[PDB]
From a paper:
Five distinct GT protein folds have been identified that are capable of GT activity (termed GT-A to GT-E). The catalytic mechanism of inverting UGT such as [name] is a direct displacement bimolecular nucleophilic substitution (SN2)-like reaction enabled by an enzymatic base catalyst.
Moreover, [name] crystallized in the presence of scopoletin (III), UDP (IV), and a mixture of scopoletin and the non-transferable donor UDP2FG (V). Complex V and IV represent the SI and product-inhibited enzyme complexes, respectively, as they were obtained in the presence of an excess of substrate (scopoletin) and product (UDP), respectively. Asn372, Ser373, Glu376, Arg249, Ala351, and Trp350 frame their donor binding sites and in both structures, the indole ring of Trp350 points in the direction towards the uracil structure of UDP2FG and UDP, resulting in a π-stacking interaction. His18 is 4.0 Å apart from O7 of scopoletin in complex V and presumably plays the role of a catalytic base for the deprotonation of the acceptor to allow the nucleophilic attack at the anomeric centre of the donor. The non-productive complexes IV and V are compact, fully resolved, and display a closed active site. Phe53, an amino acid of helix H2, interacts via π-cation binding with Arg214 of the UDPG-binding pocket and approaches Trp350 4.1 Å in SI complex V and 4.0 Å in the product-inhibited structure IV, while the distance is larger in all other structures. Structures III and VII differ both in the length of helix H2 and in the spatial orientation of Trp350, leading to the formation of an unproductive SI complex V and a catalytically active complex VI, respectively, after binding of the respective second substrate.
Residue numbers in the entry: 3 to 477
């Protein structure tokens, strides 16, 4: 049983860097493996760096070591209109020569390479050194089913996916409304559509796929991935639901937001955040402002400067301070009026400490998967406000299938959410009986997910499975 060494590669972002850090911690801790993390990082991030601090010094004895990898300049392959998907692909691709050397320099060669959903293009580095290779899909199995099967849809739709009148039926799974298609499928003539479709096929060339979900949450989709005849003509490797994997709450006391929360009533605060990436569009930010206020509900609202372009176009940076005081893009005297009723928090906040707090009763989220899982594992119900990526599909699951979120009658992206509607949703969630029923569903998923990670039970075992697969391949 000589000790394993697993390297994990992370694409730039935060939704991407975090679940890797978590995953590495999970393995190093519970399954006595040596982890090394190759975190690719466009050093324009601020958050990423400060993050990477409060972890490496918490993971010294832990036998985790984080090697950061700076992405090369890709400004010669992009413009104002190149998407975040494509950017991300190109960064990792251009970084591939660097990883290559980084492994080669390692003394203890890794026995297994686990790569992010965006580092699928590192396959060759593992193929070269003849190491086991797995990809880590940090989101829903439903989206992984879409990716995989998308190579088929590509060859039997013709027109645009958004123009379709019938839903796209992934074999064996929940049918996808044309409106809830992930960003890359919104336009077929775009570079990211072909990148997406390549991603789908790249998944099949790994030795297995880790997913940040659990059997109890999305049963059918996983069963479809394992046994569905049409799908399995395409997939042909193990899946490993190892979730839900989230960060620990760190006992940080000097935080002001917390000190504000300590003065509040239980389950009395709506928490608002559009994740690490997302921004609102000035009008939507205004309507949201009035929503919170008309609601007469206590709130914490992480706000960032609005933009009437793409919500996600910030995604890559996150290290720009600028000269626009938050009181610019908020309504006149908003922080005067709402003081003692809410908290506007610029740029960033301690999301896991917040969501774990007694006074937080609700969460208006963008439906990123790590945010969602942070919500569900604290049994916090949610307002579903998808902006980009696969969040439309996640919101679809959370509202329709799992029943732990509410949402506006039209997608925010498709039409403005007026302040009345917002106020309405906030009151529903926080203060109506429907509110409390949704909260209970959330608390049941909380317990579900507790059993998933407890010894025995789905996700724990799927790790022991993965490790056994590694150790058999060591052949
Ligand atoms: O103020 C803040 C805001 C966020 N965070 C943390 O950063 C992560 C962002 O949440 P989420 O996974 O939804 O991230 P995001 O990168 O926006 O989503 C993309 O990346 C995700 C990949 O996991 C994907 O699911 C999604 O569809 C993509 F759009 C998550 O771990 C939060 O706890 C924080 O600490 N403080
Ligand atoms: C635009 O950005 C993203 C798009 C998708 C689409 C499908 C998926 O399974 O994951 C994604 C992760 C992303 O960061």
């Amino acid at each position: 049983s000589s000790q394993l060494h697993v390297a994990i590669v992370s694409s730039p972002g935060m939704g991407h860097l975090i679940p890797v850090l978590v995953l590495g911690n999970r393995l190093a801790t519970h399954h006595n493996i040596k982890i090394t993390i190759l975190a690719i990082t466009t050093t324009s991030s601020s958050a990423e760096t400060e993050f990477l601090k409060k972890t490496t010094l918490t993971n010294e004895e832990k036998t985790i070591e984080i090697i950061p990898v700076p992405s090369v300049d890709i400004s010669h392959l992009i413009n104002s209109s190149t998407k975040i998907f494509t950017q991300l692909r190109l960064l990792v691709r251009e970084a591939l020569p660097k990883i290559h050397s980084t492994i080669a320099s390692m003394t203890h060669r890794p026995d297994a390479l686990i790569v992010d959903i965006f580092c699928t293009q590192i396959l060759p580095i593992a193929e070269e050194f003849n190491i086991s290779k797995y990809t880590y899909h940090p989101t829903t199995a439903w989206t992984l089913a879409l990716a995989i099967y998308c190579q088929v849809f590509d060859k039997e739709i013709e027109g645009e996916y958004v123009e379709l009148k019938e839903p796209l039926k992934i074999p064996g799974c929940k049918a996808l409304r044309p409106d809830d298609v992930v960003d890359p499928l919104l336009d077929r003539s775009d570079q990211q559509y072909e990148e997406y479709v390549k991603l789908g096929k790249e998944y099949t060339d790994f030795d297995g796929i880790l997913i940040n979900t659990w059997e109890d949450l999305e049963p059918e989709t996983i069963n479809a991935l394992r046994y569905n005849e049409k799908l399995r003509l395409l997939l042909k490797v193990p899946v490993f639901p190892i979730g839900p994997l989230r960060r620990k709450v760190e006992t940080t006391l000097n935080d002001e937001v917390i000190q504000w929360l300590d003065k509040q009533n239980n389950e009395s605060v709506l928490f608002v955040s559009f994740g690490s990436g997302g921004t609102l569009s000035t009008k939507q930010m205004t309507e949201l402002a009035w929503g919170l206020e008309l609601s007469q509900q206590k709130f914490v609202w992480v706000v960032r400067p609005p933009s009437d372009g793409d919500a996600d176009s910030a995604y890559l940076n996150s290290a720009g301070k600028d000269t626009r005081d938050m009181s610019e893009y908020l309504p006149e005297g908003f922080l005067t009026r709402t003081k003692d009723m809410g908290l506007v928090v610029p740029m960033w906040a301690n999301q896991v400490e917040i969501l774990s707090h007694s006074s937080v009763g609700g969460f208006l989220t963008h439906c990123g998967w790590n945010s969602t899982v942070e919500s569900l594992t604290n049994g916090v119900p949610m307002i579903a406000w998808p902006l980009h990526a696969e969040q439309k599909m996640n919101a679809a699951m959370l509202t329709e299938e799992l029943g732990v979120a509410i949402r506006p009658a039209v997608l925010p992206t498709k039409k403005l959410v007026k302040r009345e509607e917002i106020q309405g949703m906030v009151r529903i969630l926080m203060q109506t009986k429907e509110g409390k029923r949704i909260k209970e569903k959330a608390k049941k998923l909380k317990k579900s997910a507790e059993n998933a990670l407890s010894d025995g039970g789905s996700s724990y075992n799927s790790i022991c499975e993965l490790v056994k697969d590694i150790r058999s391949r060591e052949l």
